[PDB]
């Protein structure tokens, strides 16, 4: 009832006494006994990730004898590597009780039997909570390192607040039919007021506690320059460290799996072993390399490419131009017994490691060999390496970056914040007085490193609410987030998902919606790459979405546009009318064909095409870098073999589409941007349009869907951008056009980002999946009759209405051409199954 007797080993016992998380254990357990939602504001290097669930098993969480808390214990590491490492850690810690510890890192893994204090992953228990909205099983829930402000942590505590509210409400009247629910949140920083003292997240104010530790002096060293190749900078620095500096292990904060494996094999090459055992151990570490776990697991920040970034040396120096021999950290003496060419026990640590390389960090090196870790953010707050003294930091971590309405959308490696950078630097003075080497200047560290942002701010809210719908929570408009986003924007996100087909009219996610939610990309592009696996158009569509995600390739008006300027503009227009232009005059076939032209060129003939046909070098190289990776991503998710697909060369390169494939890709990009459609104003207001041929082509007015039509003239009247093939030829613009986005010019004319042209019927066929269009009654005035088969079937002939003109509250919308449908009479209304070809 009160507790069951626990036992641990002697050395781990005294280690728990020596680390300062043993001091506040009674105050924490009494705050847990007196209140459910308890906040802990600890840090890394303390011990709170490990020993607090042991404190909960001491307190009686997991004890069947207590009638208050007879349930499970769930410890929620957001990274599955952290989940398994702390699982084996507390399996060592509880010892004779240590068989009561378990892990569950993916969804296909279910609960193992021998545990009652089990580790898991954030997405794992969110799907668990989704199919168990009640959560009978788990008496307690531990949210550690929630300070990171992940989207998974945000959705996690946003569900868990209402979860613990309803569970406590049902429990406090009757303990028999309803048990307690003890929520224990941890963090690394102390800015936990957005978790505790937010009235939307918690109207009831929960108690806040601390239990931090001690740290030896960290000597931080900023370099006089900042190198371009940070890998070679860190490698040269770390060979000088292991050559000259006193003993103490190394942690190298670098970026990715490829660079980390290259640095690990280079370090093993520089400091090799003669012994076959250690040589084969390093061989096993270099052999076991990759894993993905695409769909049937949770996901992390190792998608490894969705990034349109680009770089150079003048770009880097112009970014850090505020920064205007004897080097810091090169002070102490080499110690005796420590040779300059000592063997190095090298270990990579990225999130895509196997378990039999994730356990090898915590093994002692051979004598005469110094330990070394080359890693990324797993060893920042969750994990810590017992024995490091030198840490060396590149200051760049891979996360999500996206800016709006301009086609920049990259999952790139930016620049880490000041708080997280100092948290990475504080691992130097951790075992003794240590040395951190930050691979830049302190002027750089001052300027471009911000102080304190959430993934819910860095990621689009449409993908955020699609993630919530795949996790099956429906009361999203009033859902308690720490940073609840713009309600206008998330209502536009729900409207956008209804437009794309992810959400029905009763707001439950479809199968196509879940296949959109699997993607680490925008909902529009995810719809594109889900739909275009039809009739061999996938290289064309992946070229188009790669071009829109990388940005504008055409050197058009960042330059000229008297004796050579005329000839250069003439040859520039000739390069436009050349192999850039052969198929139609819509807009975007040039943007397809310039990348299809990258197959018609040998590798040593690289610079002549950009330098002749006015293309940007780094963007034109990163689109043909991005195309392979994006085709890999969508082939991996939609093809019948998930992980094992590879991308050959010519199928990413090219072929040539004639007529059926250009009209098919036209309806594909319509499926991409079905709510960014536009009409020539003759078919809505032919008097105000003044439809004449001598009106300029960037003055024939276009009207978007869903926009308010007040009696002012230029409300919807947005115009064509000058950078299309219209404004360059302009004979007669087709009536229905597409755009990507809108940019207001200086003359108060909202110019466009026009894409293509549809007449009526592929637009209707695309919109049919969406919830844009509302059908009419069957119209058989002068035409041929509706043929039934049954009182629930119909072969009728109906006109569709796009922009919902029923009860027109100024949302402008237009009719289409009549089309023959095949209805099925669902629940009183007549939904449509398909169309009928002529």
């Amino acid at each position: 009832a009160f507790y069951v007797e626990v036992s641990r080993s002697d050395e781990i016992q005294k280690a728990r006494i020596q680390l300062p998380v043993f001091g506040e254990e009674h105050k924490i357990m009494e705050a847990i006994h007196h209140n459910d939602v308890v906040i802990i504001c600890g840090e890394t290097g303390s011990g709170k990730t490990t020993q607090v669930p042991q404190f909960l098993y001491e307190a009686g969480f997991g004890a069947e004898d207590s009638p208050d808390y007879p349930g499970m214990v769930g410890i929620t590491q957001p990274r599955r590597v952290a989940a398994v490492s702390m699982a084996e850690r507390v399996a060592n810690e509880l010892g004779d009780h240590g068989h009561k510890v378990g892990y569950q890192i993916r969804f296909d893994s279910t609960a193992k039997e021998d545990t009652k204090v089990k580790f898991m992953t954030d997405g794992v228990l969110l799907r668990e909570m989704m199919h168990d909205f009640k959560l009978t099983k788990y008496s307690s829930i531990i949210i550690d390192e929630a300070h990171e402000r992940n989207i998974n942590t945000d959705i996690l505590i946003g569900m868990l607040s209402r979860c613990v509210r309803l569970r406590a409400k049902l429990h406090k009247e009757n303990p028999i039919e309803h048990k307690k629910l003890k929520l224990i949140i941890m963090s690394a920083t102390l800015r936990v007021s957005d978790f505790s003292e937010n009235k939307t997240l918690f109207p009831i104010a929960p108690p806040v506690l601390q239990v931090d530790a001690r740290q030896f002096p960290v000597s931080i060293h900023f370099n006089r320059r900042t190198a371009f190749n940070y890998t070679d900078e860190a490698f040269r620095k770390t060979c000088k460290i292991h050559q000259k500096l006193p003993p103490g292990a190394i942690l190298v904060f670098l970026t990715g799996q490829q660079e980390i494996t290259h640095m690990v094999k280079r370090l093993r090459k520089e400091f090799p072993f003669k012994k076959n055992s250690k040589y084969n151990k390093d061989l096993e570490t270099p052999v076991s390399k990759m894993g993905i776990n695409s769909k049937t697991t949770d996901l992390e920040a190792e998608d490894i490419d969705f990034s349109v970034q680009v770089i150079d040396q003048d770009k880097f120096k112009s970014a850090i131009r505020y920064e205007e021999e004897e080097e810091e950290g090169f002070e102490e003496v080499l110690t005796e017994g420590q040779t300059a060419n000592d063997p190095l026990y090298v270990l990579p640590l990225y999130s895509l490691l196997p378990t039999k390389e994730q356990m090898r960090v915590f093994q002692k090196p051979p004598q005469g060999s110094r330990l070394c870790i080359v890693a990324t953010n797993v060893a920042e707050t969750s994990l810590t390496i017992p024995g490091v003294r030198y840490v060396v930091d590149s200051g760049r971590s891979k996360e999500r970056k996206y800016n709006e309405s301009n086609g920049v959308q990259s999952f790139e490696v930016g620049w880490v914040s000041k708080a997280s950078a100092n948290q990475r630097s504080g691992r130097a003075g951790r075992t003794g007085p240590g040395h951190c080497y930050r691979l830049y200047s302190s002027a750089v560290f001052e300027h471009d490193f911000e102080q304190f942002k959430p993934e819910i701010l860095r990621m689009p809210v449409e993908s955020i609410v699609l993630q919530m719908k795949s996790m099956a929570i429906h009361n999203i408009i009033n859902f308690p987030f720490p940073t609840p986003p713009d309600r206008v924007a998330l209502s536009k996100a729900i409207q956008l998902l209804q437009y794309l087909g992810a959400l029905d009219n009763k707001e439950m996610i479809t199968e196509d919606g879940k296949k959109m939610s699997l993607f680490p990309l925008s909902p529009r592009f995810s719809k594109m790459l889900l739909v275009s696996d039809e009739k061999a158009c996938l290289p064309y569509i992946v070229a188009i979405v790669s071009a829109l995600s990388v940005g504008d390739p055409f050197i058009n008006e960042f330059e000229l546009g008297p004796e050579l300027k005329k000839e250069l503009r003439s040859k520039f227009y000739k390069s436009r009318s050349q192999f850039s232009k052969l198929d139609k005059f819509s807009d975007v076939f040039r943007l397809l064909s310039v990348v299809s032209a990258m197959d018609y060129v040998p590798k040593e003939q690289k610079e002549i095409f950009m330098k002749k046909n006015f293309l940007r070098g780094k963007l034109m190289e990163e689109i043909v870098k991005l195309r392979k990776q994006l085709m890999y991503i969508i082939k991996s998710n939609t093809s019948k073999e998930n992980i094992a697909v590879v991308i050959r060369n010519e199928d990413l390169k090219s072929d040539i589409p004639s007529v059926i494939q250009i009209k098919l890709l036209k309806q594909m990009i319509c499926a991409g941007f079905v709510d960014h459609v536009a009409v020539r104003a003759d078919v809505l207001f032919p008097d105000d349009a003044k439809i004449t041929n001598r009106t300029s082509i960037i003055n024939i007015p276009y009207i978007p869907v869903l926009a308010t039509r007040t009696p002012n003239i230029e409300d919807c009247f947005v115009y064509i951008h000058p950078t299309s093939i219209l404004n360059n030829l302009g004979e007669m613009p087709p009536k229905y056009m597409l755009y990507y986005s809108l940019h207001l010019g200086g003359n108060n004319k909202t110019r466009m980002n026009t894409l293509c042209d549809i007449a009526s019927t592929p637009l209707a066929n695309i919109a049919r999946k969406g919830l844009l269009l509302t059908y009419s009654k069957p119209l058989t005035g002068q035409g041929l009759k509706t043929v039934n088969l049954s009182p629930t079937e119909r072969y009728c002939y109906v006109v569709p209405r796009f922009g919902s003109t029923v009860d027109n509250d100024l949302k402008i919308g237009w009719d289409l051409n009549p089309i023959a449908v095949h209805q099925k009479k669902q629940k009183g209304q007549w939904t449509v199954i398909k169309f009928i070809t002529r």
Binding site: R80, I105, R106, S109, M290, G291, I292, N293, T297, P354, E534, E641, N642, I643, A644, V645, V646, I660, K663, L664, K666, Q667, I758, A759, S760, T761, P762, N765, I766, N817, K834, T837, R838
Partner: protein, 51 residues
Amino acid sequence: EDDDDDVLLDHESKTVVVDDQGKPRFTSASKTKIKFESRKIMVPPHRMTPL
């Protein structure tokens, strides 16, 4: 008022990527005819001209 007409309806590799739990996974296989048989039947030479 000109409406278009579009349907809009509906090799191998030499490497592995295994799993997070062991469990290897290989790439796709290449694609996969009846017989070449014959039958000789004699004609008696009184049903020859009808044949």
